[PDB]
Amino acid sequence: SETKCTLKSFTVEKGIYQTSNFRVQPTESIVRFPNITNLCPFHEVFNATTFASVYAWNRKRISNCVADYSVIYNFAPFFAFKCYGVSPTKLNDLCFTNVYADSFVIRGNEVSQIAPGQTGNIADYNYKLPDDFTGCVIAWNSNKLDSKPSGNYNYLYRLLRKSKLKPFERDISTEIYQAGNKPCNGVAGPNCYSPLQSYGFRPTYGVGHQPYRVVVLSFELLHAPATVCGPKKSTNLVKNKCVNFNFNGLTGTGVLTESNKKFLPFQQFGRDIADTTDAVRDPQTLEILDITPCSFGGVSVITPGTNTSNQVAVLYQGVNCTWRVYSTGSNVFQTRAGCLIGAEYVNNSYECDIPIGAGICASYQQSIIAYTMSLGAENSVAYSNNSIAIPTNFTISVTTEILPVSMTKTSV
């Protein structure tokens, strides 16, 4: 029926055909995490007091920790979770190599200014970001607590900077009046225009003059070490079985076997010229496991004409059978082309009508049989040093030969 589908007809002729591949299915899932499970010191920039500003970005080098959903979302009224890399819908079941929760506390009038395209205070060489900036933007409110009466003058921002500032670089200085034709240098005074801008927001002001704390993250992937992610049950591995393996944020599908080579003491992500992960180290122990995918194949169907019969014999290309061939049938063979089930075997020699490979040919006898090649009839002509053979009759034979010359013209 599959061959009938692929031919898009109601009668197949003869010979080799093709269909989809074998694709043996996996069994289950394995998690592989370090057994050490401490608690992550999140929420420190979230609920204590007035934390920081744009003058001191929170350069928190978070060490090994276990962070999850429970500590975060401590206050429900957030703002737009402006995704840049991973979507905010899923933040668990993936581990980061590092994280740097940058923070600044300015008002929430201009939330879009943090974008690489949307500019503003950032454009005049303030706190900058690169073009990718894979972390999200957490613009959570800070009203009625940082909204000090008559203005939080201790909260302030830099109006301008003379020269170009690289992203993630601190420029906190006197910032004298180096501009202008008059050589004031921030000391003489006229049109000095210091970057100092203290805040005079009374709570009676609009919502554009109320503080909204902004924290952002930054990380990267495709690295062996990890430091922070959510919890999971790292069940023990399975030996030589087609499972779905996960190793601290990197997934896959294949069989895991014991390693034979030796890794360097700090090396845990070995690979070869195949440019794919050949082996990996255990997250808990020193055990190194080689990965090789579960077996593919090539499925082919052998049939005579539907005018004669409707039996078939199926061959799996390039798969040893002796073996991973699911169910069975009448007879199983071990030809060098792969596995073959459906046809018998016989040592008698016959010509070929249905080729298979490596000199094996099958045909209808009252059954589908298979054999090896037969080149032709054996012969041997007598020979001497003084013997000759001469003909006496002659026949006239005519044969044909067909040749195409012209194929149909076309225009578009």
Binding site: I390, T400, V405
Partner: protein
């Protein structure tokens, strides 16, 4: 061009076996050829010798080879059996009766 307008001795190009003739016919998108050929049918085995001794003189056939049905000797062409009496016009003489190997002794008639 080389199969109809002439006769070619290139084997397995103008047909199968020795080539004699060919006739072309047309067909929708192309041509078909009929090849009139020529093949020998049945054969007999004979005993042969490369040269004939006569008065210390070696003889060589102008065409064909020498055959012998056991009784006497004749000379015939290569692709058909048609024996004829060995005569000085059918052969040419060079050298003597020791250089070649396998030469037999017989007589050649001269008119």
């Amino acid at each position: 061009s080389e199969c109809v307008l002439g006769q070619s001795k290139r084997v397995d190009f103008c047909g199968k076996g020795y080539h004699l003739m060919s006739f072309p016919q047309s067909a929708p998108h192309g041509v078909v050829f009929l090849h009139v050929t020529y093949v020998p049918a049945q054969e007999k085995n004979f005993t042969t010798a490369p040269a004939i001794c006569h008065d210390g003189k070696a003889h060589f056939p102008r065409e064909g080879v020498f055959v012998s049905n056991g009784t006497h000797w004749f000379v015939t062409q290569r692709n058909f059996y048609e024996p004829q009496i060995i005569t000085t016009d059918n052969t040419f003489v060079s050298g003597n009766c020791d250089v070649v190997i396998g030469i037999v002794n017989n007589t050649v008639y001269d008119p």
